[PDB]
Amino acid sequence: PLSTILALDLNDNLKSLSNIKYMFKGAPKENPFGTDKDVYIDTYNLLYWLYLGEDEELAYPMNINYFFTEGRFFTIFGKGHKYKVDVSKFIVGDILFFGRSDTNIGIYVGDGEFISMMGKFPKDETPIGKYKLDDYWNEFNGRVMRFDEEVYI
Amino acid sequence: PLSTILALDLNDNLKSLSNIKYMFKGAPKENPFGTDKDVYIDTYNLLYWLYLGEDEELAYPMNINYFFTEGRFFTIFGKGHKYKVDVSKFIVGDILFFGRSDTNIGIYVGDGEFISMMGKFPKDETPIGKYKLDDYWNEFNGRVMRFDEEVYI
Amino acid sequence: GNKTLIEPRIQKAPNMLFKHQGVFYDDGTPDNHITTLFISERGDIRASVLNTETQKRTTQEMSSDGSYRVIKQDDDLMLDEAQVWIEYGISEDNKFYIKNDKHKFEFTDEGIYI
Amino acid sequence: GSYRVIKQDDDLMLDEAQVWIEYGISEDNKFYIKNDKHKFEFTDEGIYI
Amino acid sequence: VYKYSSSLYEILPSLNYKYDDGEGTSIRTYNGKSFFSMTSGEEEKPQATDFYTGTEYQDLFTSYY
């Protein structure tokens, strides 16, 4: 699948993407992968740049309103419920939401982990990294989504 | 009638009163008619100065609260209704209100027209003029009043 | 609830203001102090304190373009046609200045001028 | 109508302040910046310290 | 009719009242003639203006029984 392959590529190249930094709503005009210079990018723009490398384009800045009506996704689990036993049933590439108001999102990877940027709010210098799901399981919020390209347009 | 004669005199002298300018709440201490110098006057003060030339005095600044309790007027048509066929039944000299909160008023003249000052809010330089009622019929608000001097005091 | 945005009915920008005034107080003298916190649709901010009977006003005004300006008046409430007044702040252009009826004191980006 | 900004380092109350700095418009039309040392003042006419 | 019918007009135990409407007009009052107001339409601009001395409390139509 496209999403799984992209997630595996990101995991393989995760250590080499230290140039990408964390910011609240970073929306740079330069592709992080096509430049060695450091650049501040958030999770939504990171996903947009990751999916723009292939033929898919999506849209910019790809805020929370993108998922509501664009039809690019179909929900797997709804918000409001939180089960720790069903986490194993998920697959790589699924988008994981965080925060009570959709403050941040993430990409699921195997072995009970997820890829996202975490740090202090006022433009932290910490680069992208991978964190265990146990400590962040509290703020998972239960929302899960998945991609689909074959039927769209 | 006093009001009709005053309205006819104002219509005859409308072209010669270019010195009078428009402002939101202009309340000058100088009579516009007794001076060649330009002066900023709003509709309420204009009516006060027009009626002060004769024996009648009324009061100053003659705000919206004047009509409520002074007893100088009796309503012809109430607010909340708007009929375009009954407009012909009106007579010259009737006071025409405008705005949802009594922002501005006017004096009715024949041939389906009214006399008022219209312009941009921050102290427009446009002088007094006459405008067709068709475009301003939307903001008429239905309120109409009339004068009476014989029975008062 | 059904994954739909709550569109505002009116899209035009509002204009807020906090007008404060009274009639009298325990001292017995009449109340004549008027202050406002008006905000325009274009983004301007004006905090002012007025005394209508004495014909005095002091205003802290912000323009939509981003001009800092504080104006004090002694004999005219309206900003226009002010005889005695003092002004200091940032104009629409990047120039710090203090001006009055006499020649002003100005601090351009380079140098000092009067 | 007096514009005034006051900073204090060792006393919350305005009265009886030892170390402080003030700048703004007094009740009289005079722009000034004052501290413990002699102030810088800009009257309607001229410059004085 | 929506302009006038849609009006959540309420009066506190104090005679100062609170007002909301389907349109952008929204008026709140406090002790004395002090009040808070907001609006967007240019026609309703005098209701929440600050020209010269600002709009009077009597000018507002919601301030009358």
Side-chain angles (χ1 to χ4, degrees):
Chain A
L2 186 65
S3 60
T4 308
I5 292 283
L6 291 167
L8 290 170
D9 297 2
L10 180 59
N11 184 19
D12 299 328
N13 300 278
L14 182 61
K15 188 174 182 179
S16 299
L17 294 167
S18 179
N19 301 120
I20 313 190
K21 295 174 178 174
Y22 169 75
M23 194 163 65
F24 157 67
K25 196 172 70 173
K29 294 171 282 185
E30 190 177 10
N31 192 314
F33 308 140
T35 187
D36 183 71
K37 301 176 183 178
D38 298 0
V39 73
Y40 296 83
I41 287 168
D42 66 324
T43 53
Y44 300 103
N45 289 259
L46 187 71
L47 194 69
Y48 172 79
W49 285 117
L50 287 160
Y51 276 82
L52 188 64
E54 313 304 337
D55 298 359
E56 301 296 342
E57 189 174 0
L58 308 178
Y60 205 70
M62 193 178 181
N63 67 86
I64 193 68
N65 190 21
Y66 190 95
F67 302 95
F68 277 70
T69 59
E70 294 290 352
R72 278 284 191 175
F73 303 86
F74 56 96
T75 303
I76 314 309
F77 278 89
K79 187 172 175 181
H81 294 158
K82 174 172 166 291
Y83 308 142
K84 194 171 184 178
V85 170
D86 212 333
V87 176
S88 301
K89 190 171 182 179
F90 302 154
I91 51 173
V92 183
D94 301 332
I95 292 165
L96 309 188
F97 286 75
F98 296 94
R100 186 168 180 276
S101 63
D102 307 329
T103 57
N104 198 334
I105 64 101
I107 318 190
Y108 177 75
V109 63
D111 308 330
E113 298 178 352
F114 67 101
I115 293 164
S116 294
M117 305 189 189
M118 299 295 177
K120 61 190 293 185
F121 186 84
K123 191 172 178 176
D124 190 5
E125 207 71 1
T126 311
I128 191 173
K130 178 165 60 54
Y131 310 91
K132 296 183 178 181
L133 181 54
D134 297 0
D135 62 330
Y136 286 96
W137 173 244
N138 302 327
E139 300 180 1
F140 178 60
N141 310 116
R143 195 187 296 277
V144 179
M145 308 191 79
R146 191 174 295 179
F147 240 113
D148 186 8
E149 278 78 352
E150 189 176 3
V151 70
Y152 193 75
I153 62 172
Chain B
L2 186 65
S3 60
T4 308
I5 292 283
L6 291 167
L8 290 170
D9 297 2
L10 180 59
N11 184 19
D12 299 328
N13 300 278
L14 182 61
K15 188 174 182 179
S16 299
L17 294 167
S18 179
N19 301 120
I20 313 190
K21 295 174 178 174
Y22 169 75
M23 194 163 65
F24 157 67
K25 196 172 70 173
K29 294 171 282 185
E30 190 177 10
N31 192 314
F33 308 140
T35 187
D36 183 71
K37 301 176 183 178
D38 298 0
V39 73
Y40 296 83
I41 287 168
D42 66 324
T43 53
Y44 300 103
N45 289 259
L46 187 71
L47 194 69
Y48 172 79
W49 285 117
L50 287 160
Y51 276 82
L52 188 64
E54 313 304 337
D55 298 359
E56 301 296 342
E57 189 174 0
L58 308 178
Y60 205 70
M62 193 178 181
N63 67 86
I64 193 68
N65 190 21
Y66 190 95
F67 302 95
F68 277 70
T69 59
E70 294 290 352
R72 278 284 191 175
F73 303 86
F74 57 96
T75 303
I76 314 309
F77 278 89
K79 187 172 175 181
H81 294 158
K82 174 172 166 291
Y83 308 142
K84 194 171 184 178
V85 170
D86 212 333
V87 176
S88 301
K89 190 171 182 179
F90 302 154
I91 51 173
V92 183
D94 301 332
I95 292 165
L96 309 188
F97 286 75
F98 296 94
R100 186 168 180 276
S101 63
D102 307 329
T103 57
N104 198 334
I105 64 101
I107 318 190
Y108 177 75
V109 63
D111 308 330
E113 298 178 352
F114 67 101
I115 293 164
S116 294
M117 305 189 189
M118 299 295 177
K120 61 190 293 185
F121 186 84
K123 191 172 178 176
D124 190 5
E125 207 71 1
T126 311
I128 191 173
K130 178 165 60 54
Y131 310 91
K132 296 183 178 181
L133 181 54
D134 297 0
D135 62 330
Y136 286 96
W137 173 244
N138 302 327
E139 300 180 1
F140 178 60
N141 310 116
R143 195 187 296 277
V144 179
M145 308 191 79
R146 191 174 295 179
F147 240 113
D148 186 8
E149 278 78 352
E150 189 176 3
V151 70
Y152 193 75
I153 62 172
Chain C
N2 194 17
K3 309 298 291 298
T4 304
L5 183 66
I6 294 166
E7 62 190 340
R9 188 173 181 278
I10 303 300
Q11 302 297 342
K12 298 179 182 179
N15 50 265
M16 296 57 66
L17 76 180
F18 184 84
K19 194 163 184 294
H20 160 79
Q21 57 182 340
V23 181
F24 72 100
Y25 32 88
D26 295 5
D27 302 331
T29 56
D31 189 6
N32 307 313
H33 312 79
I34 317 299
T35 181
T36 56
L37 303 175
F38 177 81
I39 295 164
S40 180
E41 302 93 329
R42 206 177 295 278
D44 296 359
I45 294 164
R46 274 188 290 278
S48 305
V49 62
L50 288 69
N51 191 328
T52 185
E53 291 190 355
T54 66
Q55 198 73 358
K56 300 181 179 181
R57 178 170 188 181
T58 297
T59 298
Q60 183 271 317
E61 176 166 10
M62 304 301 298
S63 181
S64 301
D65 62 78
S67 177
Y68 197 102
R69 177 165 59 179
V70 171
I71 319 190
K72 181 171 181 297
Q73 299 183 127
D74 186 70
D75 58 351
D76 188 7
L77 304 176
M78 300 180 67
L79 304 176
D80 302 329
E81 193 177 0
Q83 301 298 76
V84 171
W85 55 273
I86 178 163
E87 182 178 330
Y88 80 101
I90 308 304
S91 59
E92 53 265 26
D93 190 3
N94 177 19
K95 294 190 181 183
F96 180 81
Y97 65 98
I98 310 94
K99 56 167 63 174
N100 65 90
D101 190 4
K102 206 64 173 179
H103 293 68
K104 67 190 182 180
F105 180 86
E106 194 172 17
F107 176 35
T108 327
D109 301 75
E110 300 182 356
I112 296 285
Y113 305 92
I114 293 164
Chain D
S2 177
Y3 197 102
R4 177 165 59 179
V5 171
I6 319 190
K7 181 171 181 297
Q8 299 183 127
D9 186 70
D10 58 351
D11 188 7
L12 304 176
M13 300 180 67
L14 304 176
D15 302 329
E16 193 177 0
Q18 301 298 76
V19 171
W20 55 273
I21 178 163
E22 182 178 330
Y23 80 101
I25 308 304
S26 59
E27 53 265 26
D28 190 3
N29 177 19
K30 294 190 181 183
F31 180 81
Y32 65 97
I33 310 94
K34 56 167 63 174
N35 65 90
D36 190 4
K37 206 64 173 179
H38 293 68
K39 67 190 182 180
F40 180 86
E41 194 172 17
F42 176 35
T43 327
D44 301 75
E45 300 182 356
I47 296 285
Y48 305 92
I49 293 164
Chain E
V1 171
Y2 187 87
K3 301 182 184 299
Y4 301 91
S5 182
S6 304
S7 59
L8 181 62
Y9 179 67
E10 300 179 359
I11 298 165
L12 291 172
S14 306
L15 295 173
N16 59 268
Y17 64 96
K18 187 181 287 185
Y19 176 80
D20 294 323
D21 196 312
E23 299 293 348
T25 185
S26 180
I27 294 161
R28 183 173 175 184
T29 52
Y30 309 102
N31 292 271
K33 273 62 175 179
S34 59
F35 66 98
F36 183 86
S37 178
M38 50 170 59
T39 189
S40 300
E42 189 66 12
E43 177 265 312
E44 301 180 358
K45 190 69 175 295
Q47 295 174 227
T49 192
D50 197 357
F51 181 80
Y52 183 25
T53 56
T55 190
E56 296 291 351
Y57 178 78
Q58 288 76 349
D59 300 331
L60 305 176
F61 77 102
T62 59
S63 300
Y64 298 98
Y65 288 108

